């Protein structure tokens, strides 16, 4: 059974990740999101614990969906003859971090700090589960506005985490690191930290720093809004040209700008309910 268990609503959107619909689970009105993808269009595949051929995305979501976290969890999935259907958590009410920033402009540092910490935990969770997301960006982060909680989405560019080099990538070019641009080579964590540097700038300035390849490889970070010296230093650290000069997750979360983070409910009361 599929269209019995889940009542399907309006299309939420569609693109490189397939077609995603609003839905409600009928056994308990749980809000969900239903994501379809054609087998013809899947570029990457894996094998489940059952040992079955599945899109890599299912493999990765299953590894990170154990326990609670800052990731949007996979509740279920069906295979169809020409497609796969994934049933996913949906917060309600929700807005993605890309629209939130467009509507509100550059975020206050205290709020940027709360969001960015939550994204850092969510990514740490992924890495601990052997998953590398490879498309961290504002558009792949949802805000649960009531709870003040950020959740990661879209594992369709992801890979298994490994310590050797990656020579394939197909996430968002503007969040991709200079060693991808110049050599079609990168290592997982160091690339992730670059993306997070781009994300932090996006949060505190209102937009990403670089649009063009030449800008990505030049690593000159002009700040277009007032941003504290501590935050500027963290961002420039994340955006070091040489991968090995970038900070680890630990150095980031121990950086002085990162201290005294608000709790998620505090973040909601102060910055989201009003």
């Amino acid at each position: 059974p599929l269209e019995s268990q889940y009542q399907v609503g309006p299309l939420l959107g569609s693109g490189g990740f397939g077609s995603v619909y609003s839905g409600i689970r009928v056994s308990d009105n749980l809000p969900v999101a239903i994501k379809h993808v054609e087998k013809d269009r899947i570029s990457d595949w894996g094998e489940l614990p059952n040992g079955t051929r599945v899109p890599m995305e299912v493999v990765l979501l299953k590894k990170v969906s154990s326990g609670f976290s800052g990731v949007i969890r996979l509740l279920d999935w069906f295979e169809r003859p020409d497609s796969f259907v994934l049933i996913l958590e949906r917060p309600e009410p929700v807005q993605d971090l890309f629209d939130f920033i467009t509507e509100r402009g550059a975020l206050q540092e205290e709020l940027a700090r709360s969001f960015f910490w939550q994204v850092l935990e969510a990514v740490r969770h992924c890495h601990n589960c052997g998953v590398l997301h490879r498309d961290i960006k504002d558009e792949n982060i949802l805000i649960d506005l009531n709870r003040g909680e950020l959740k990661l989405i879209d594992f369709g560019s992801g890979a298994l985490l490994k310590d050797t080099v990656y020579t394939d990538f197909d996430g968002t070019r503007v969040y991709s690191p200079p060693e991808w641009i110049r050599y079609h080579r990168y290592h997982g964590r160091s690339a992730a930290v670059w993306s997070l540097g781009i994300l932090l700038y996006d949060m505190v300035c209102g937009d990403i720093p670089f649009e063009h390849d030449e800008e990505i490889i030049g690593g000159q970070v002009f700040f277009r809004q007032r941003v504290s010296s501590e935050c500027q230093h963290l961002i420039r650290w994340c955006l070091a040209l040489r991968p090995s000069d970038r900070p680890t997750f630990e150095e980031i979360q121990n950086h002085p700008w990162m201290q005294d983070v608000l709790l998620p409910q505090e973040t909601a009361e102060i910055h989201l309910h009003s």
Binding site: G15, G16, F17, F98, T102, D135, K137, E139, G156, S157, D170, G171, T172, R173, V174, Y175, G206, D207
Partner: peptide
Amino acid sequence: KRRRHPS
């Protein structure tokens, strides 16, 4: 000129 960026 702010905008989304697909994969």
